[PDB]
């Protein structure tokens, strides 16, 4: 993998899931409003829709997976990093149509683009531990 449109869908999903984390608006309204107001002409919109819905309907599960790796943090996990890790863990656990290495690499790139200094190193470290548990075949 993967097509540029799918990459762009995951980018937009980080933005929209950040929106949802901060606004607490209904995810159906977040999906509608984001797609009505953002330029998505280069996006795999179906994949974007499926990502929001999936992360939204599995958030307790995803945050549960994430929790142990956050045990050492003195500060609350950043909102962008939380969105990136939710998406990455969701893709690893439910979107096995996304290759293992793509899910990981694209998460690191999203953290590099949107995240705090060294965000991408933190994300790499979490996924290095969590990903082989979710997909033991590493594919």
């Amino acid at each position: 993998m993967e097509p540029a449109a799918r990459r762009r869908a995951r980018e937009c999903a980080v933005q929209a899931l950040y929106s949802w984390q901060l606004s607490q608006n209904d995810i159906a309204d977040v999906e509608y409003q984001f797609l009505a107001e953002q330029d998505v002409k280069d996006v795999d919109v179906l994949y974007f829709r499926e990502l929001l819905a999936g992360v939204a309907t599995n958030t307790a599960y995803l945050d549960g997976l994430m929790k142990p790796y956050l045990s050492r943090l003195l500060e609350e996990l950043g909102q962008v990093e939380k969105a990136v890790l939710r998406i990455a863990l969701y893709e690893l656990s439910k979107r096995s149509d996304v290759p293992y290495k793509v899910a990981i690499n694209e998460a690191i790139e999203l953290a590099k683009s949107f995240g705090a200094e060294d965000s991408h190193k933190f994300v790499n470290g979490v996924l290095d531990k969590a990903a082989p548990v979710i997909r033991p075949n590493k594919k």
């Binding site: 901060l22 606004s23 608006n25 984001f34 107001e37 953002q38 950043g78 683009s113 995240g115």
Partner: protein, 87 residues
């Protein structure tokens, strides 16, 4: 004088900060102030970080006089830049 009904007007906000913790706190505060105000929020969204500067966009639709007053009262932390417009 008063701003009137602000029909079809939007408050557009852009935030910048070197500290992501401050920018996300300010964003949350703006969202909460708007929603408790009877207004609706669009976004907020993060933009890619540029020159070590974090960036957020958020808009407030159907703002009321109570929204504007609540935003004015809100004390935004040192270290966050907020650009704001109404129209």
């Amino acid at each position: 004088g008063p701003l009137g009904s602000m029909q079809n007007q939007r408050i557009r906000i852009r935030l910048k900060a070197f500290d992501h913790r401050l920018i996300d706190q300010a964003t949350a505060e703006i969202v909460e102030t708007a929603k408790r105000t009877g207004a609706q929020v669009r976004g907020p969204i993060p933009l890619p970080t540029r020159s070590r500067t974090h960036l957020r966009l958020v808009d407030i639709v159907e703002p009321t006089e109570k929204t504007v007053d609540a935003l004015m009262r809100l004390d935004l932390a040192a270290g966050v830049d907020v650009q704001i417009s109404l129209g």
